[PDB]
């Protein structure tokens, strides 16, 4: 079964800063056949409906601000928010969709 590990569990920066967080997978999520990573990032603001941010490691979902960038491939991924807004307070989850689906433990983004 695929293990999805996110670091750190929690972090805080000030409005307007850049942050990055890590997501690692126990197994490569890339298929050579269609050149896709089966890895997506989600945002769940506290107490509400999650939202899709990024799919295929680096493709930003329609509607999502270009603040958000996903990068990496294989087993190693990161989400970068270039200029954090108050709206961004949330837990960010990476999720493998290579074999069924499994979410990581999340990284809670707090604001200072």
């Amino acid at each position: 079964d695929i293990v999805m590990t996110q670091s750190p569990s929690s972090l805080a920066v000030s409005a307007g800063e850049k942050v990055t967080m890590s997501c690692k997978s126990s197994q490569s999520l890339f298929k050579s056949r269609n050149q896709k990573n089966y890895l997506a990032w989600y945002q769940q603001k506290p107490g509400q409906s999650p939202k899709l941010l990024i799919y295929w490691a680096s493709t930003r979902e329609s509607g999502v601000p270009d603040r958000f960038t996903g990068s990496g491939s294989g087993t190693d991924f990161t989400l970068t928010i270039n200029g954090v807004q108050a709206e961004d307070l949330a837990v960010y989850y990476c999720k493998q969709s290579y074999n069924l689906r499994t979410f990581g433990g999340g990284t809670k983004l707090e604001l200072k």
């Binding site: 769940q44 409906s49 999650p50 295929w56 979902e61 433990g105």
Partner: protein, 121 residues
């Protein structure tokens, strides 16, 4: 405009069962898989299962954590998704979400507002 609306959550006795519903609109329902995900208080999102689209024959898959206990189905004449929850325990207390899913993006692109389920005697 895509809409997904979960309903049917509430209080349930341990051991008991509940049926959650997810009514959909704004897209061709049968074209998509539908997934169920939950967030227990204080805990990470957890994918529970999906039911595939028409092209795949609407078959199902589950997390090890619920396989054999929960069952997913859909009524395509109503564009409605169901989660049949059985043999519930305290640890199944959570907010349950339905989400549109599939092999187009291998991602869950639209999510309902959630329904809350508390398992307590």
């Amino acid at each position: 405009e895509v809409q997904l609306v979960e309903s049917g959550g509430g209080l349930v006795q341990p051991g008991g069962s509940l049926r959650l519903s997810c009514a959909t609109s704004g897209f061709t329902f049968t074209d998509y898989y539908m997934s169920w995900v939950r967030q227990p208080p204080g805990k990470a999102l957890e994918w529970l299962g999906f039911i595939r689209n028409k092209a795949k024959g609407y078959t199902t898959e589950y997390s090890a954590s619920v396989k054999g206990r929960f069952s997913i189905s859909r009524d395509n004449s109503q564009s409605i998704l169901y989660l049949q929850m059985n043999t519930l325990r305290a640890e199944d207390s959570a907010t349950y979400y339905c989400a549109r899913d599939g092999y187009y993006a291998d991602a869950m692109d639209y999510w309902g507002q959630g329904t809350s389920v508390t398992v307590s005697s």
